[model samples]
Target: MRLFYAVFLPEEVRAALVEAQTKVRPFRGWKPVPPHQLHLTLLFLGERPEEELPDYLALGHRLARLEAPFRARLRGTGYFPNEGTPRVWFAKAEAEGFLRLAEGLRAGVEELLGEEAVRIPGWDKPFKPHITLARRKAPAPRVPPVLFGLEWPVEGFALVRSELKPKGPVYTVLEKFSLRGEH
Candidate 1:
């Protein structure tokens, strides 16, 4: 199964983001991400075997112990590639703690899966914490700004399994780890 680490949003945040998505209801082929599926993705880990579940859980436990919970806000509006010719519309997430946790996850992935695994699809890009709001099948003429101000405390993150079916991607949480640091 293809896996990724995700920070799920609070109920209020999801609701507010769903409402904000109306602004960028792009062309015919565009689709807004479902409210329940809204989340900040940390890293996209490649495919893994089902038998590796135990190792994944062990890594989560280690990360949870090392990371203290933090808060982040979703604001600003932009599109992937650029606004003039965009394929994705998203909101930015701001939190230093988020970056730190991502860094730690990279280290954990190296230790568990090896350095080759760390160089996945987005490893070359700088970390730009974002939550995708909408996607289009093709480049569009215009995309309006999606304005929203939603913040939440980051208590935990989950290891998620993503299955891309004919309809869309379906996500399932394999394990969850609360951020509890001992300083």
Candidate 2:
């Protein structure tokens, strides 16, 4: 199964994204990411055998202790690759501590899994964090300007499980790790 480590937004952040979905859904033929599946993916751990999950879980535990809890304020909208033929759109976050936590966790996981585990080329680049809001079904759809104004609070994050299907990817929260009390 394919796996990745992530920091999920709090319930309020999810609610706010849901609101964005409601606002975006009216645009015919655009494919917005399901509000429930929106997240800030920290490390995309490619397909792995079921047997390796124990190692993965152990890795998650080790990274959990590194940093204090932090806040993320959802900010402006943007696209992936290029804006003209955009494939993904997301809301940005301004929270350095969260970024550091994600970075440390990614490094820690790679360390445990060894150099082989961190081989995915995309992992080498500096982290760029965002909460996905919508996905276009085809090339060049007009996303509304109102999406730029979204602002919300992020209190915690989660480890998610992904089930791939012909229709779309289904996400389930396998376990959640929160940042509280330490802030």
Candidate 3:
């Protein structure tokens, strides 16, 4: 299964984001990520085998210990690959604690997964806190004007289980880690 590390948003944040994203309607069959399921990935670990899940779970546990609860706000809307031929759309984050949590997880990933296993192409810079709102099935010649800019607070992270099916992937929370902050 393809695996990654991420921080899940609280319900209020999720609902607000979902409402904001709904305004930016693209072509038909465009899947806007469900509001209750919004998240910000900390480290993209790519594919992992079922046999290696124990190791992955242990890694998630270790990361949880190192990371504290952080705050995140969705501030901007942007596209990947310079607007045209844009395949990924996401909400921008403008929070320092969110950035630090990402950095902490990156350090944890390097420590646990080793340099080779955790390498992601074009991720050398700092982690830009963002939640993927939608992805086009194929590249669009012109990037759709998606007005999905909104800000919401984030407070926790989770170890998610992803099961891919014909329609799309189903996600389940195998484990959850709370952020270190006021509730």
Candidate 4:
């Protein structure tokens, strides 16, 4: 299965973003990301065998026990591969404890699966947390600023399976890991 670990956005926040994105849908050269599919990916595990699913869930359990709930807010809008010549546009997220959570997850994955098996090659780079808003073949026309501010409590993360189709990818939650503070 093709899997990844991500923090799903709350419903109200997703609704607000959907409304904001609709304002700029008239702009040419980009496809807005569906609100239901939005999430902040903590780690991308790529493809793995079905038998290994249990191993990942066990790791999730271990990681969850060591973490605690935290607050994260979505604000600002930007693009990837540089703003001037952009291909991917996204909404910025400011989560104070997000980096530490990501680090712990990565370390746990490497420990459990070994470095060679954790083959999502951007591990060395700093994790820039964002929810992708759109993708375009060319830079998008100037969009009215989507200055949205929505804060939500992140209580858990989920292991998701992505099934790619011609239309778009369908994400299924395979397992959820609650952040119960360490005793």
Please provide TM-scores, in order, for all candidate models, with all chains considered together: 0.90, 0.82, 0.77, 0.89
TM-score (C-alpha, index-matched) for candidate 2: 0.82
Clashes of 2: 2
Cα lDDT tens digits, model 1, 122-153, are 66677789998888775444456766677789
Deviation from native of the Cα of residue 6 in model 4, angstroms: 0.4
Worst ten in a row by lDDT for model 1: 138-147
TM-score of 4: 0.89
Q: For each candidate in the order shown, give its overall lDDT on alpha carbons.
A: 0.81, 0.68, 0.65, 0.81
Better of 2 and 4 by TM-score: 4
Candidate 2 Cα outliers beyond 4 Å, as residue runs:
144-155, 180-183
Q: Where is the poorest 10-residue window by lDDT in model 3? A: 139-148
The candidate that achieves the highest TM-score relative to the unseen native structure: 1
Model 1 C-alpha lDDT versus the unseen true structure = 0.81
What C-alpha root-mean-square deviation, in Å, does candidate 3 show against the real structure? 3.5
